[PDB]
Design a protein around this nucleic acid. Structure first.
Lengths: 898, 228, 228, 228
DNA sequence: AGCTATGACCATGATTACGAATTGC
DNA sequence: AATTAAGCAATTCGTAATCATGGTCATAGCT
């Protein structure tokens, strides 16, 4: 096991690097690094710049010397190249080659502090004392739980594992016993010994990576503020490995955000991680809600103020803290995120925190690639942020389209980058720009035939590959290689499973298996002769290999999808506004071009004229309407729905797809792009059930559509499944019960027809009155209530949910319940006529419940009608009226006047 | 043509139901609404001699009230509408038949399933008070052997149960029982005595408020039930 | 019940004071400002036999004015209010007595420092001019031995030193001096001849307007001065 | 000094065109458009003793109407306007004459190229149709030897080629021909019988309406045609 | 005493801007 | 000391201001 870095920091003119050895022990060292940059030189040198101009190396004895040199160099306004951040240069020089890592050499720490008080524990105040602490260590896979017995806010008894393992009906806490099997209890009667023990455990068991649920929000700040106020400055300093803990208070407009960085340890939050890589937004962002969403695990429900729970049950208090840390670890295990960031950083050879910014990692990887080809990285130049035009979006006709075919480009932006061969160095010049509508109709002449052009009006170097396209090809090749490895391992696992279920052998010696390769049939026959234990060991090894391959491929996917956001940014090193504008403009041109071509071809085949068959779409995705083709052929010939589905599948795969491909070949011919790459694929098939008076699909506006999909990609669905997008169903704002009933209504309109919609509307009308008050509420989000907070009453231009928040704060100020702050989703409810609170809406933290003194008052004045019509009736009416349906049979004089 | 003030008021009501109109030669006027739930017909004292369609009747009636009644109205030389006064002349564009919703033909209302009479005062009270209490919908049904009406508020009572307004209508000697529900929005007849002819079959009936100056026809709601 | 149209007018003028009102049995009607600076009482010739509290007074008096005057009022079988005329019965909902600000008992207030009489038309004129000139406040005072009222605006003349309007009640019989400042948002009295009664002790003070039907009490402002 | 009811009405009419006004001593009242497109003047029977610039004239007439016509207007102690009544006193500030837009001297009207008369009913009906037909342009011309007025919507009909409205004023026995375009906003005259005079010199053109109380002068559009 | 016409008032609706919130490529 | 860090296009509701539109009680008028 080769040595690989764990953390890197700069102190003075020295780099402190903590890392792992050959046998797997975490140790640190200091290196007085020697910075080695490059400057422009007229004499020919091996290391040339981006454009080919020569660069002469320059060495300094210290980082400060190089920084001062750069200062006096920029003072004379002369260009000097190299890598500014000496940490990246040092870490690249130290390793250079690839890095192989193991998860048992990295210490992941999941901490959580539970503190009671009369008022919400403010990290700025740090007034109360931390009477419960949990710290899970990954390498020890051990929870360390420390409980304060005596406190000014209450004295409690000692916690028990057995009692915490008992059922609630038996007075227990239902904590899993396998957890307490990995739990070490250090109770303390006094806070002083508590703090000292935590500090020395931190110092002896120094975590390589620290993460937690909104850790930097409260966990880190409150602890550091408490130790600072109780033991001066040495307290916090000694927490850091090298006595370097720095305050980074981000005083926003609304409040303050104290940020503490422990230098030498990669302090990385986990709430931001779920808010960055998960791509799914929940009605709540509490730990309990996300835990219920990921691990289906529900903590024993509690009713009352959190602080008052300790005074009634300390056992359940500690149990809740333990289970919440356990849930954090569990959701990470099922999601696989910390390993993801670690893999990304090791692949790109940058400090762990560099995962937080795609600019950073792309800069590092490009630096590494250019160092591999012996080139010189240019310095960063100042710029000004400018909003270039974005992605063109169609305007669908809000008419329910029965038959829709979807088509899409795969990874549009990287394909554009590589196809057009664009890069900050490949710039050659600008051409006479023609009006865009000329290009969309293929009427404007060729801007140039010697350089690859872009309809933003530029020509860039031909023949020569661009560095960014080079790296795009590299990452694409690695991605497809990793996916083929994944497929091979999947086939191996399936073959071993079928062998085992057919029958196992009696060989108890585990043989050697090459990773990331497909097993041969002879190999499978050999493996069929082994014992069950060996087979299971091979299965788990294959599963772990598959997980690593999935991590690699998903990291590559994140990199490629993030490169587009990386390229357009002032702080980016290879930033070039013209390049990004070229990319987006070319995307718009291509999508509108193919839109016109599709309309032309569909008019040709269907025989009509000037018909807009292209339903809608945006960048890399166009949905067209093809019901006219079905009418041309006829619905009677299909005995079953699947017959229609397979017919339209064949029609999509064999009839127009070559036309799209040849249209894009003609496109790449018209342009001077290096290579045609815009592969278009059929995406999904939308059609109503045969014979049913359903509608099949509809839209409401741009980026708003509901399509009953029968076969997305090629994965044929036995029953059709709905792919609703943009509508109120996906929105978190809609209440959960309203969300589900609305989704059922949408399914009914898509599949059955109007009458089912009306019947279910009546059923929901008669049920909605008798529903739980928890599942009918808009959730929205409170941001800067202080901006609209004015003496317990709404201010000017006061947003609705903020008004409800103010009403709730009026209601429960002095009641000592959990208060509402920014970020916390606040479910709101409307109040009718004369409410005791004094306003029409009241808002409580999402997921939470109202304490019983106000529960009766709220349930006595819940305005069922207004909410029912402003959350469920109104969007339903919008959808149905966009689909030629009415939810309530109204009728007319058609019996007679007709 | 000369349109007497009573004809102007009747046209104003027919504008309230529908902002546009079409008319043919004669003395019989028929106007529908876009939603199709309302119909109206009448026989004005004056006579129309030329067919024409008007898009914005409100301004039309306003300007005709501005000018003398004797001032003649006719179709202009360009196909539009011209009105000549003793000293002035006005021109109004002609609405096309397609651009204004118009009723197809006179409606053959079948034999009435039930019949009653409402006096002007009671109808005026109902129309004036349904806004005060947000009485969205009305029901006409058989209570204690007499036909009566009662107001139900739909916005809060989808079940149609909470009795807020209730007015006695009159006797009804019939073994049949019915529960006709009508949207207040379609209740747009001009204040006056009316004879209710209510018909129903299958799932769609109608109500004919007939009066000396015009007859109005209102659709019934699906909630309306009947047993014969 | 059978409330005269004068009773309805009194109720309507009471609605502008407080959104809702209680109704105790008898001949006595009173209500008070939500902020408590204004209070109104009156004796009604019509007889009240049962108590009920209602929040939406304006709509209720409106619908009552809508119905025929012969109608009768009682409490519903569901705890609401029901009003029935010759042919129609209506059910106006009743309210939870908690919501309404219910004054517990009328203020007898026997003694006072100053007394005068203001005519109806002068009150009307000063109310109209206060509306026109945005006169937010007035002050009843004595100058040249004359009971007078002077109007000013706080939002512009914060010190209230520049007079924007003046009216003389008359001469002052006594020799005591005072200057009572009264916000104009309090003035809700029915337009009629009133007898003005001024009292003030230390910090607190009171201005009363007595009419043939109703009497009004308002509290002076914190800058009101008095020495007797 | 006192203002009679007719004077109040006339100044009310005059406020319709200009926000402010100058009140000069004597029996002459003057006003000019804020953009100077229209002019008006009148003679009263009340002797004026002082000049004062008035900015919020609509409020001034509103407050004047609320009091009796025998109220006296005087120069207040603080360089403003005082209204003294039998029992009420009002202080309305006087605006700065520099900021108030008004002519510095009366403008005599030269000889008229065209002479005719317009009845009060004609003015009323043309203003009403201008409101109803949302006209913006009026072309006064001579057709068949008759001085007439036609209405054209310049925004919709830039060529004024569609006579939506027309009205004949008089019989003109002259080879002189003209066609003058005027915007409606210039027309602010009070209803009444008037005499119309037209006077143009090449590009320059203007019209004048004379009545028994007040007179108006209106600017014309430069696109007007004329051969005299 | 009652229909007729006018009139500001007050309600209300329609518009339009703006900000806050949230997806989706 | 590191510069501190995806991009844009799109949709919907509430508020607010603001005007316009329209009943309506209020007011002047003739039968």
């Amino acid at each position: 096991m080769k040595e690989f870095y764990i953390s890197i920091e700069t102190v003075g003119n020295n780099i402190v690097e903590r890392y792992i050895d050959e046998n797997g022990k975490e140790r640190t060292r200091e290196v007085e690094y020697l910075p080695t940059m490059f400057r422009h030189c007229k004499e020919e040198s091996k290391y040339k710049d981006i454009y080919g101009k020569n660069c002469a190396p320059q060495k300094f004895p210290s980082m400060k010397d190089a920084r001062d040199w750069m200062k006096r160099m920029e003072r004379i306004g002369l260009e000097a190249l190299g890598m500014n951040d000496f940490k990246l240069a040092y870490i690249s020089d130290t390793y250079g080659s690839e890095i192989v890592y193991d998860r048992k050499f990295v210490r992941v720490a999941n901490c959580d502090i539970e503190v009671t008080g009369d008022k919400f524990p403010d990290p700025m105040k740090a007034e109360y004392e931390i009477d419960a602490i949990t710290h899970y260590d990954s390498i020890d896979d051990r929870f360390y739980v420390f409980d304060l017995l005596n406190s000014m806010y209450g004295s409690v008894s000692k916690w028990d594992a057995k009692l915490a393992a008992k059922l609630d009906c038996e007075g227990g806490d239902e904590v899993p016993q396998e957890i307490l099997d990995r739990v070490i209890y250090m109770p303390f009667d006094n806070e002083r010994d508590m703090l000292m023990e935590y500090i020395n455990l931190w110092e002896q068991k120094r975590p390589a990576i620290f993460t937690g649920w909104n850790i930097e929000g409260f966990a880190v700040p409150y602890i550091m503020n408490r130790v600072k106020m109780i033991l001066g400055e040495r307290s916090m300093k000694r927490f850091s490995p090298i006595g370097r803990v720095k305050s980074k208070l981000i005083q926003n407009m609304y409040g303050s955000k104290e940020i503490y960085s422990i230098d030498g340890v990669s302090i990385l939050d986990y709430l931001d991680l779920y808010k960055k890589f998960a791509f799914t937004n929940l009605p709540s962002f509490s730990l309990e809600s996300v835990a219920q969403h990921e691990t289906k695990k529900g903590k024993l429900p509690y009713d009352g103020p959190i602080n008052k729970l300790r005074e009634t049950n300390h056992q359940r208090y500690i149990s809740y803290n333990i289970i919440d840390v356990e849930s954090v670890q569990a959701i990470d295990k099922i999601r696989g995120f910390i390993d993801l960031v670690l893999s990304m950083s090791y692949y790109a050879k940058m400090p762990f925190s560099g995962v937080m910014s795609p600019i950073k990692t792309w800069d590092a990887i490009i630096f590494n690639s250019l160092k591999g080809e012996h080139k010189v990285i240019p310095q960063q130049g100042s710029h000004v942020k400018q909003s270039f035009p974005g992605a063109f979006v169609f305007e669908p006709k809000p008419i329910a389209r029965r038959y829709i075919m979807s088509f899409d480009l795969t990874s549009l932006y990287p394909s554009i980058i590589r196809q057009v061969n664009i890069s900050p160095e490949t710039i050659r010049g600008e051409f006479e720009v023609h009006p865009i509508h000329e290009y969309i109709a293929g009427t404007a002449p060729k801007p140039s035939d010697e350089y690859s052009c872009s309809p933003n009006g530029w020509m860039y170097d031909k023949h020569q590959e661009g560095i960014i396209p080079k790296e795009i090809a590299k990452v694409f090749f690695q991605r497809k290689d990793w996916k083929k490895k994944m497929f091979a391992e999947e086939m191996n696992a399936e073959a071993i499973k079928k062998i085992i279920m057919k029958g196992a052998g009696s060989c108890s010696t585990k043989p050697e298996v090459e990773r990331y390769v497909k097993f041969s049939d002879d190999f499978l026959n050999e493996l069929s002769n082994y014992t069950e234990s060996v087979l299971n060991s091979l299965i788990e090894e294959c599963e772990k290999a598959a997980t690593l391959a999935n991590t690699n491929q998903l990291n590559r996917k994140i990199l490629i999808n993030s490169l587009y956001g990386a390229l357009g940014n002032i702080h980016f090193r290879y930033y070039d506004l013209r390049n990004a504008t070229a990319i987006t403009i070319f995307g718009q041109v291509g999508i509108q071009w193919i839109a016109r071509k599709i309309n032309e071809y569909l008019n040709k085949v269907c025989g009509t004229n000037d018909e807009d068959f292209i339903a809608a779409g945006d960048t890399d995705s166009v949905y067209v309407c093809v019901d006219k083709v079905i009418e041309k052929v006829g619905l009677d010939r299909f005995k079953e729905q699947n017959d229609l589905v397979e017919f339209m599948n064949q029609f999509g795969k064999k009839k127009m797809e070559p036309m799209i491909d040849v249209a894009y070949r003609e496109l790449c011919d018209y342009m001077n792009n290096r290579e045609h790459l815009m592969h278009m694929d059929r995406e999904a098939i939308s059609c109503p059930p045969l014979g049913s008076k359903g509608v099949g699909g509809f839209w409401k506006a741009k980026k708003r559509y509901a399509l009953n999909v029968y076969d997305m990609e090629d994965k044929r669905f036995a029953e059709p499944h709905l792919k609703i997008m943009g509508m109120e169903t996906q929105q978190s704002s809609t209440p959960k019960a309203v969300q589900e009933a609305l989704e059922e209504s949408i399914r009914r309109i898509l599949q059955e027809g109007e009458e089912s919609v009306q019947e279910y509307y009546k059923n929901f009308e008669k049920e909605y009155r008798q529903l739980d008050y928890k599942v009918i509420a808009e959730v929205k989000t409170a941001n800067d209530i202080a901006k609209y907070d004015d003496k317990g009453w709404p201010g000017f231009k006061c947003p609705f949910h903020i008004r409800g928040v103010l009403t709730y704060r009026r209601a429960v100020s002095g009641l000592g319940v959990a208060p509402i702050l920014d970020g916390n989703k606040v479910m709101v409810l409307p109040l009718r006529e004369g409410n005791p609170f004094g306003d029409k809406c009241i808002a409580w933290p999402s997921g939470t419940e109202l304490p019983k003194e106000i529960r009766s008052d709220v349930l006595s004045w819940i305005d069922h009608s207004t909410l029912f019509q402003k959350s469920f009736v109104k969007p339903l009416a919008g959808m149905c009226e966009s689909a030629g349906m009415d939810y309530e049979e109204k009728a007319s004089l058609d019996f007679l006047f007709g | 043509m000369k349109l007497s003030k009573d004809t102007t008021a009747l046209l104003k009501n027919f504008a309230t139901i529908n902002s546009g109109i079409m008319l043919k030669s004669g003395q019989f006027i028929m106007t529908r609404a876009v939603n199709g739930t309302t119909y109206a017909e009448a026989n004005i004292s004056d006579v129309i001699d030329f067919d024409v369609a008007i898009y914005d009747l409100n301004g039309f009636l306003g300007i005709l009230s501005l000018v003398n009644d004797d001032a003649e109205i006719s179709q202009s030389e360009d196909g539009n509408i011209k009105i000549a006064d003793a000293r002035s002349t006005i021109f109004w564009p002609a609405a096309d038949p397609s651009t204004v919703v118009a009723p197809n033909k006179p409606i053959p209302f079948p034999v009435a399933s039930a019949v009653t009479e409402i006096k002007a005062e009671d109808l005026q009270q109902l129309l004036r008070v349904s806004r005060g209490l947000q009485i969205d919908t009305i029901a006409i049904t058989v209570k204690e052997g007499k036909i009566v009406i009662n107001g139900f508020n739909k916005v809060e009572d989808s079940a149609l149960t909470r009795v807020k307004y209730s007015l006695t209508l009159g006797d009804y000697d019939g073994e049949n029982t019915f529960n006709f529900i009508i949207n207040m929005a379609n209740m747009k007849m001009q204040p006056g005595n009316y004879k209710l002819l209510l018909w129903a079959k299958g799932k769609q009936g109608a109500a004919k408020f007939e009066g000396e100056h015009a007859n109005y026809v209102v659709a019934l709601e699906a909630d309306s039930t009947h047993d014969f």
